[PDB]
């Protein structure tokens, strides 16, 4: 609905090579998550 | 530590009677004077009376409004204070207090509510608001008792929210109004806990 | 959203399974698509995919 | 006769600075034995209230040494060294030289100091259900206005409409009034404040 909502505590959404992208609110949110590689190396490597 | 914890809420109507006893834990009963003070809603409190220690033994005061109407007793194995209703009348339906003293009211407990109202309970007539081009809302009329609680998008929305308070008419029943002011269709919900009357609301200009 | 999420995981699967090979990061970031793309790349020990 | 006890009422209170509640006496409250005869309470907006001073200086235990008050014979003052956000509520002071104790004052509601806000007049026509429902309640809503010192006038005069206030939030520091003007079925073929926020009276009918 086109009304406000509230939200949470901020996560890190990795799918885009590190943890850079918040959250993708995007409608191929899922199909990024389910296809495109979370690009681990360079997200593992940030986190460390 | 000590506590002076009441009991005895309930819902009347006018020309009966009701009990009202307060817990006393804690201390010597026999030495603090047991005094009575009623809280209108919404408004300041007001002392309905008191009884005077065993060892002093004295008498009971109670306020010009309560005369012949409301009596104070005490005891010490027991240690529960009594405060008696009959000939209950509308200017009763509000909160009353323990306190620990004639005139010092040292201490209050948490408060009972003693309603006297002409209703029983009812369903609700829940009445939506029309914004004129802003905010939108949503009456609950006619519901007895208070338990309500109102929430905007089923519980969604938290910004802005309002329920209004219970409204005070004279049929005994009361009014409650929950309104969003934001800018733009929105859903409000009202759950009457004894009625079990589920209402769901959409609202337009 | 939570319906959307359970019909895309329930209603096609697939036959994906999750295995690691020993491909260098870069050299294993060329695999895209054609049910051989990566799932996580690791460094140039072992790959997940 | 009785005592005239009238502390003044309305002070505001914003957390981290020194504030000071003064109070009436018609005759001296300062008796004999050299001490005074006065109580100063907190109501707990939701709960139970609790003492703060005694023989108009002596502090009471338990609550913290924040309530500071003396007095003259018959000039009294409770001066609260500070607030917090929790130090809000309505005082009392019950003066306690001729029982019997009926009253305790009208009662000053404090809240949190801010400055004026406009206040925002809503005017809500009620709804067609209604009317043909046997009811009709015409709401001019007021939100977001402090502080609380305006009523809701109702031309074409008042009489039926109700006064329904709820008490102060916590982020916004603002408040909010319903005027449900309960009305019948052939007498519905404009409201007002009169708030400080601002001077001229803004006209908006249903």
């Known amino acids: 609905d086109f009304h406000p909502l509230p939200g949470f505590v901020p996560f890190f959404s990795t799918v885009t090579g590190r943890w850079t992208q918040p959250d993708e609110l995007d409608a191929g949110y899922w199909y990024r998550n389910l296809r495109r590689t979370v690009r681990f190396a360079d997200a593992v490597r940030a986190l460390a | 530590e000590v506590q002076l914890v009441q009991s005895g809420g309930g819902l009347v109507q006018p020309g009966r009677s009701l009990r009202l006893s307060c817990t006393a834990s804690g201390f010597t009963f026999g030495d603090y004077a047991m005094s009575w003070v009623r809280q209108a809603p919404g408004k300041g409190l007001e002392w309905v009376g008191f009884?005077?220690?065993?060892?002093?033994?004295?008498?009971?005061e109670y306020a010009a409004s309560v005369k012949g109407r409301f009596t104070i007793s005490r005891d010490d194995s027991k240690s529960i204070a009594y405060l008696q209703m009959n000939s209950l009348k509308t200017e009763d339906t509000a909160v009353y207090y323990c306190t620990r003293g004639g005139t010092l009211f040292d201490y209050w407990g948490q408060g009972t509510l003693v309603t006297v109202s002409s209703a029983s309970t009812k369903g609700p007539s829940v009445f939506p608001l029309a914004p004129s081009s802003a905010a939108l809302g949503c009456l609950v009329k006619d519901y007895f008792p208070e338990p309500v609680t109102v929430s905007w998008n089923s519980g969604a929305l938290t910004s802005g929210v309002h329920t209004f308070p219970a409204v005070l008419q004279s049929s005994g029943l009361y009014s409650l109004s929950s309104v969003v002011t934001v800018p733009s269709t929105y859903i409000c919900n009202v759950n009457h806990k004894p009625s079990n009357t589920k209402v769901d609301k959409k609202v337009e200009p | 959203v939570v319906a959307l999420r359970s019909r895309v995981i329930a209603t096609m699967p697939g036959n994906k399974g999750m295995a690691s090979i020993a491909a260098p990061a870069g050299e294993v970031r060329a695999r895209i698509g054609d049910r051989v793309e990566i799932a996580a790349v690791n460094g140039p020990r072992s790959v997940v995919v | 006769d009785v005592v005239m006890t009238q502390s003044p009422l309305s002070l505001p209170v914003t957390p981290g600075e020194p504030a000071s509640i003064s109070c009436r006496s018609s005759q001296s409250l300062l008796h004999s034995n050299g001490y005074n005869y006065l109580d100063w309470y907190l109501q707990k907006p939701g709960q139970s209230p609790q003492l703060l001073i005694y023989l108009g200086s002596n502090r009471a235990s338990g609550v913290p040494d924040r309530f500071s008050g003396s007095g003259s014979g018959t000039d009294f003052t409770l001066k609260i060294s500070r607030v917090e956000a929790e130090d809000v509520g309505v005082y009392y002071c019950?003066?306690?030289?001729?029982?019997?104790?009926?009253?305790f004052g009208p009662g000053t509601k404090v809240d949190i100091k801010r400055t004026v806000a406009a206040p925002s007049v809503f005017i809500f026509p009620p709804s067609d259900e209604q009317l043909k429902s046997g009811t009709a309640s015409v709401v001019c809503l007021l939100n977001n206005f402090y502080p609380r010192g305006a009523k809701v006038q109702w031309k074409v005069q008042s009489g039926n409409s109700q006064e329904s206030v709820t008490e102060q939030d916590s982020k916004d520091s603002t408040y909010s009034l319903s005027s449900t003007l309960t009305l019948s079925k052939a007498d519905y073929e404009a409201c007002e404040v009169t708030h400080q926020g601002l001077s001229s009276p803004v006209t908006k009918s249903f």
């Open positions: 019950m003066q306690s030289l001729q029982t019997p104790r009926l009253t």
């Open positions: 009884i005077r220690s065993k060892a002093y033994g004295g008498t009971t």
